[PDB]
Symmetry: C2
Amino acid sequence: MVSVSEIRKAQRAEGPATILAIGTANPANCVEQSTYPDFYFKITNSEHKTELKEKFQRMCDKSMIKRRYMYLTEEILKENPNVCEYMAPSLDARQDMVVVEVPRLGKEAAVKAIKEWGQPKSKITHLIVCTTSGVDMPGADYQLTKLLGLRPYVKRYMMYQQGAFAGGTVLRLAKDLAENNKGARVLVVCSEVTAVTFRGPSDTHLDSLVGQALFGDGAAALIVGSDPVPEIEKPIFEMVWTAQTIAPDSEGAIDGHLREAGLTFHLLKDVPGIVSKNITKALVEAFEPLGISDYNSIFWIAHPGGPAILDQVEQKLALKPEKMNATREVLSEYGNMSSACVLFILDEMRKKSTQNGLKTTGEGLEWGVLFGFGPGLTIETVVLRSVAI
Amino acid sequence: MVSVSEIRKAQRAEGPATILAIGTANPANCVEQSTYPDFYFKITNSEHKTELKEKFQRMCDKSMIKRRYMYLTEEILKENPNVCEYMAPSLDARQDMVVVEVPRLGKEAAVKAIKEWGQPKSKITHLIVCTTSGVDMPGADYQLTKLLGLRPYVKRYMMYQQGAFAGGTVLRLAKDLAENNKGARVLVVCSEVTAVTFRGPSDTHLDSLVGQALFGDGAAALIVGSDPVPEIEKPIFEMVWTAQTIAPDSEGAIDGHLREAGLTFHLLKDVPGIVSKNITKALVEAFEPLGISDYNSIFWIAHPGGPAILDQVEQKLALKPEKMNATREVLSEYGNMSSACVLFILDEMRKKSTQNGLKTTGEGLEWGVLFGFGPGLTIETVVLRSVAI
């Protein structure tokens, strides 16, 4: 008696998943990079490690980061010596920080995205929360549902321990949720807090030390939906196609283990080298079907894992220096905020395009690409289309 | 020049997401429930706790579980005294077990599902892995991609620290992935291992003790896709509609925290009571639109969190005793395997329906319901349609 074909046709949306609002937030403590080597070696009681401090100074000087926002403060660190050591039992203390800070910071970003969107929060049907900092049950998705007062029947997707490519993963996921469900409006929150990874320096663990020069905190929230209501809602970017892949010859490039001493990162190959060697293949898969092969003719968003990734990609492809402007501005002002970075870069790009009177939200260009990079080595690709004005 | 409307129409699938294969697996160590109180009190050095042992005997006797399969053995437990205590630093040891066992066990289930499906594993486009036992980077999704030799470009969804309602969550997710992507074939793996939650008894923590009578290990894998190729592929169940909700007045009903001493569960309200009081609302939301209100006229799959949940639901609704047969058979033979349970119950149901010459894979009935229950208190609902034969 019941027709599933009829239900299916009635249940799905029609157009491309569209980003309709972006909002960001960061902890209030702004940490300058210029003075960080002195601060970090003094807070971790490592001033005697002279040669290691000089190496860290060089890491910070080459980082291309001017400042980062950190939940961790001098006061908090002085109350937690076990977090200040390279390797001490400290997960309970770290989890106590981040189980609360992840949803708190995510809430600030989400409220800003919901205000921009302008529609009732009761119309949010799906919620995706993503973090690499801590885990809990119920998760940060339940906490944000409670904090924001979303309907109890919001459909939740809790993405935990994902890693830095997951700004692309949440987009890939939101595209299918929005496109397959008529009326669906997805709240997407990436919220990343370095309290789980902060640790003291060790001269036999320089891969861990690199992270201390680069990682910073932040959250970004999106509203994603298909079939925007013309003039009530305001499209910013459309998603058209997505991929995820594991680069060949990259086993153990970025491993991260959550242990009694918190989250520790290793580094076993050449990440900038692997990303650079495999980005062309990713671009031809995405853009050959669209007939485009000039990679300066599209707008760019790349996870700024470190500046060398960006430099080697630019060099490999002969990108004009300006292509990575929005990416590098986020790296400069906020550091590497793991999954949230790429979403901050979308906000910077559309704000600067709008501010400067360009024709589209993608720097005046029609088609664009967003890349996430992280453990695996994983590359996430999202093909975007800009919107006029 | 490029039409996004044309790309979108060409990119999506047409019909309902369909389960095309189910495969399960469990650790080889079969632990009888009849003798478990003696074993568990002797392995945790708690034989002097006489009154507590009698309470545990009553829990085991009322469990309605005959046996469970456990990765943990007497030999492993004797090498890990910190896991045998109620609360000792032991996460590193537990993680070392489950980071390997989750993907190992998931691989066994997946190979069985892929064999049933009968198609090249190179046609798997999306992979969903779900577990509440341990976390790692790259995750168990990357490990299973490697172990099974899936294409490196499989699109992965790593669902960590989800909890027991997540057999419904992975179905909810796979439905959108399969339906919005033409040709997509999703491998779904739930793999749950009690090494993260096993711990010794404490008389002031009886909620933790209940879990020791009920939790068991197992993995289940599905192949999900839309537009099955007639006669090459073989539909088992179709998904039609899904929901997720948080029951009112259930704050802290099931909390689980991942700490230096592993994963510990609390229990603050009446779970059977909350589920029973809110299941009718869930059923009217799902089935009022389909015109059905006789809940004995549909086939049933319910997460067997414990037998009291099932009994109170049966009593509340006046379900005939037979409705929960497949659910109770899985609880009896495997215990509560968290997210995997509901997938084992689907396999038991379709196997017994086929074995006994019924007309559909849903016990001869057309429409069915699958429920997941877990932290929040969360209720996941999946409306299913059976297939003839």
